[PDB]
RNA sequence: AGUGGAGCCUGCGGCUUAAUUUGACUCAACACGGGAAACCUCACCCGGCCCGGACACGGACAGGAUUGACAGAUUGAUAGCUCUUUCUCGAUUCCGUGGGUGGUGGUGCAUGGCCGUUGUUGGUGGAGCGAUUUGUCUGGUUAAUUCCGAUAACGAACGACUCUGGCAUGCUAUUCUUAGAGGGACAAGUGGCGUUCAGCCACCCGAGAUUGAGCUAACAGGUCUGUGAUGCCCUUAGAUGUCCGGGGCUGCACGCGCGCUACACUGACUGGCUCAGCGUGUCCUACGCCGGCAGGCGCGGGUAACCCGUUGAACCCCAUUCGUGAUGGGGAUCGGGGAUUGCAAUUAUUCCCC
């Protein structure tokens, strides 16, 4: 007969653990998304992983919906990883600058800066 | 013991008497009140005090539900609520048993009253994301068989529609986790329909409310389509028992056929599920619409302004339409298809041979009348198209020959003796399906020659001497003939006559001297089949010859075919003495021989 | 069957790297012995310099082990030196052979007088030092042979040095220090700069930068 | 609770003996050799019959070499392995002389046969010329290099293998020939059987749902008696020679130790009372008779949850006598009888009664 190998199983396990959202019911869309997610050099075991993720998502979809719910922090860790504010924190209106730093900027031809404020050491 | 006993009373003592007792309520008087006492006791036996017999208790509730649900429904809602409450435990080891018990209750009941007992809390807009009763949808999917379809309409259409709308609304809203969960939930809700289509009781009145809905769901909802197709298929397979139901299905078939044809013929999709649905849905429709669609499909095929993909799709539709037509349409389709058997395109020839297989597949009906009407022309055409048959087209064609050998008359020996070498060459064809068909077809000629004479053994001897010269020619066709004899030795075991088999075995040893690996492998398979099949008392006369023949084979073919020789030595050592084979083999094989002993030592 | 792990091993397994000197050109670490067995192969000869037993002191007691000093050499070209201690003498020998293959270095051969024919001796007098042992190699005229103690004689014959004068200093009685010192000197043959190598070096592409399109595939 | 103190018994030393057969000496020496030895079981002792190789040489034998043997007389033994009786047996020979000549020899060395599966320290990396070190650890935890974690260390031990074909009117110098690359097949889909999860079957589509190449050898996994014209030492100095009769293994001043019975009044004697379980049996016994009692006789069951056997147990309980002393406690050691076991009980086998 035929039996699945351990490498395809563990790679498919990592793939379902990471990006459950992108996978779908059709087989070749699973194949192409698995192709573009990770680095797999050879075609055959990539197709094996595609078949195995298709099988396990058919198995998971039949399973009562709660496994899918507990996959909630993955996206928050992702949205946190890629969070930016609306206004840049480096875009400050007035920045305090040492007199020696001001001399360095004057000697380096940026003497016409407008956002600078020279604070003398008191 | 107590569980088996209580199950025996529930199965034999109370189960046949549901019709006499009738429905029980909380205010029963006679034996119905005793059935209420039955359920009260078996529900009281579910509490925390037991906590170890829960497998047995849940089995008892399961058999109680499947015995008495339909007429004990007003009282068991409290125990259904308790069973739903028990699954909310942190660590419940009896989840499968509880699911089986709730499924048995649903199977005896139907989803409506048990949803009145334990409601689904996925009704539209929820606050949290941890649905506590999400197992009810798999339970309903796996265990609804005998309820009404109108409940499915009036409950599962608007709520699933709102869940789909909410999922897509959240899909443009950025949240992609809740949308996926709601899409999975609504797809799970749409998988209940094959369960609802199992044995409906009002499908003569409720199918009118689902025809346009199922049409639009199979038209512009791809994610449901397979299940949708399965639903209709499931319905047919166990729902056209009555006549008004089948009349309603045909009355809506007159609308569903163009839609399914357009979905199958579109370019790119689950084409094979649509094809199976079309096949069954043509087997349950009136023949005049079959003739009209067959004429339209023949017009579409014969049109030269059609693409190759469109031509192949309409040929698949022709394949589906072929076994369900009348005699005139089948004859006209055969007359149109007959010149296509010599086409150089392998796909067109494959579809034509599939048409010929499908029209000959029906044992009764207009296909059988067409077969007895055109047997001579079919034989002449199939013998004429033998030379120019492509390699994939071998796979259906043999089956078509199968479908014309099973009802073949006595004066047809020339056709068989002309088809035989093609059948052997197909026993060594590339396709495994073609090989299976050729093996089954050789078996079919074996049965067909058991009807042309009074004595079976001489008829099989004639059948063998019709295939004996094939052991003489080219190397690949000699290996073909050895594989054919290897297959033939397995079913008609004693009917050849062992001595004749022995002669064949001796000839195999000569072909065991060949340099080619395929011939040696086929000889080893024949030797294995002969050791399995023919008697040890006649083996003992012929052990020495075959074991000497395998003894002086080579080094290379001994090393390559080590597992087949290992199995042959195992079978010989099991069937005879280890020591006789030990002396009469050459040196090196001794080592392999001794290994078999620990199998006989340590399989015990 | 050899399945390489390093990028260098994968390039050597294919027909991308033609000679071992390319690996010497870019000073790359050789981590697989099959590269040496691929390029030099049957030309390599190996002499066991010394097998000696030790009693390694463990908490169960003193257990006997064998330490092998093995010099391997492509004649007219390359040498390596390896030391391995193991339980069995054959295990120690094969480990020392592997370790000496990993440490194969090329040696420079020059001329004593006029430059007619193939180079035979060292180009200049070179010195290798290991643990108070000093080994000095002096160019010799053709036909003299290796005038040395037996251990550097073995290494210098395996180097393809036809003839050389030798001067050793220190505790020569310890064999490992002596072999490592003469190995150090015959490596310093290419560590040395002469007026021959005064022209500016044109820089070619490294094997990792030249066959990167092949290396992304595997 | 005792042991060590006492009587008896057993073990080891020692002492005796013809022999008191034997390995082990503070756990693993000490009721271990199933070893509770009257014949065997014995390894010991005292005596007595018997014969103990091939080859070479010299004799006898067919004018019997030698084998077999009934009765009787002998020695400690029914010794035709001697005499009276010498009757048969047809070469299957036995009488001396010899010889590093030895063979049913002893022991060592070398290597192989019978069975299958395919806390220690390495491997790689870092440090040191090297012995070495790191891994194998601050802390907490654990029986523990265990676990959490830190961390120049990371990993470990004690035909389901690898490659690969069918079809490309696609890219490359390209639909008919090329040879590089890119596709395509993944059990993908369907229906059943299935712990509803591993898997199995069949089928549609598809060129392909499996067509070809490569992989006796290794073992420390177990364990055991074959090959050498093998080395030595022995061979009427039998590597325990067979058999026969009788002894001994028990002998006893003494040390070191396991045990049983006791020194009594919380007890000894006599009568009555009432309760088990693990196990056994073709020798376990039921019943009746003769018996003071050990035991005999005639009868049945049980090859066994059936018959022994409701296992009818003893301590214990209730009454009688004794009354603080070598006592009626304690029973050794002796003197007589009787009965079984066994060829045989004298050096008491055992049991019973004064």
Swiss-Prot record, chain A:
The keyword Ribonucleoprotein applies. PANTHER family: 40S RIBOSOMAL PROTEIN S17 (PTHR10732:SF0). There is a cross-link at residue 102 (Glycyl lysine isopeptide (Lys-Gly) (interchain with G-Cter in SUMO1)). One of its GO terms (biological process) is rRNA processing. It is linked to Diamond-Blackfan anemia 4: A form of Diamond-Blackfan anemia, a congenital non-regenerative hypoplastic anemia that usually presents early in infancy. Diamond-Blackfan anemia is characterized by a moderate to severe macrocytic anemia, erythroblastopenia, and an increased risk of developing leukemia. 30 to 40% of Diamond-Blackfan anemia patients present with short stature and congenital anomalies, the most frequent being craniofacial (Pierre-Robin syndrome and cleft palate), thumb and urogenital anomalies. It holds the Pfam family Ribosomal_S17e. The gene is RPS17. This is Small ribosomal subunit protein eS17. PROSITE patterns: RIBOSOMAL_S17E. Belongs to the eukaryotic ribosomal protein eS17 family. Component of the small ribosomal subunit. Part of the small subunit (SSU) processome, composed of more than 70 proteins and the RNA chaperone small nucleolar RNA (snoRNA) U3. GO terms for cellular component: cytoplasm; cytosol; cytosolic ribosome; cytosolic small ribosomal subunit; focal adhesion; membrane; nucleolus; nucleoplasm. Keywords: Cytoplasm, Diamond-Blackfan anemia, Isopeptide bond, Nucleus, Phosphoprotein, Ribonucleoprotein, Ribosomal protein, Ubl conjugation. The modification Phosphoserine is found at residue 112. The modification N6-succinyllysine is found at residue 18.
UniProtKB/Swiss-Prot annotation, chain B:
Disulfide bonds: none annotated. The chain crosses the membrane at residues 464-484. Weakly expressed. Expressed at intermediate level in testis and ovary. It is found in: Nucleus, Nucleolus; Nucleus membrane. Signal peptide: none annotated. Belongs to the RRP12 family. This is RRP12-like protein. The chain holds residues 434 to 1043 of 1297 of the full protein.
Swiss-Prot record, chain C:
Citrullinated by PADI4 in the Arg/Gly-rich region. Asymmetric arginine dimethylation by PRMT3 occurs at multiple sites in the Arg/Gly-rich region. The modification Phosphothreonine is found at residues 194, 212. One of its GO terms (cellular component) is cytosolic ribosome. Residues 44-107 form the S5 DRBM domain. There is a cross-link at residue 217 (Glycyl lysine isopeptide (Lys-Gly) (interchain with G-Cter in ubiquitin)). There is a cross-link at residue 217 (Glycyl lysine isopeptide (Lys-Gly) (interchain with G-Cter in SUMO2)). GO terms for biological process: cytoplasmic translation; positive regulation of ubiquitin-protein transferase activity; translation. The modification Phosphoserine is found at residue 206. It is found in: Cytoplasm; Nucleus, Nucleolus. The modification N6-acetyllysine is found at residues 205, 217. GO terms for molecular function: cadherin binding; enzyme binding; fibroblast growth factor binding; mRNA binding; RNA binding; structural constituent of ribosome. The keyword tRNA processing does not apply. There is a cross-link at residue 217 (Glycyl lysine isopeptide (Lys-Gly) (interchain with G-Cter in SUMO1)). Keywords: Acetylation, Citrullination, Cytoplasm, Isopeptide bond, Nucleus, Phosphoprotein, Repeat, Ribonucleoprotein, Ribosomal protein, Ubl conjugation. Its main location: cytoplasm. Component of the small ribosomal subunit. Interacts with zinc finger protein ZNF277 (via zinc-finger domains); the interaction is direct; the interaction is extra-ribosomal. Interaction with ZNF277 competes with the binding of RPS2 to protein arginine methyltransferase PRMT3. Component of the ribosome, a large ribonucleoprotein complex responsible for the synthesis of proteins in the cell. The small ribosomal subunit (SSU) binds messenger RNAs (mRNAs) and translates the encoded message by selecting cognate aminoacyl-transfer RNA (tRNA) molecules. The large subunit (LSU) contains the ribosomal catalytic site termed the peptidyl transferase center (PTC), which catalyzes the formation of peptide bonds, thereby polymerizing the amino acids delivered by tRNAs into a polypeptide chain. Belongs to the universal ribosomal protein uS5 family. This is Small ribosomal subunit protein uS5. It comes from Homo sapiens (Human). The chain holds residues 59 to 276 of 293 of the full protein.
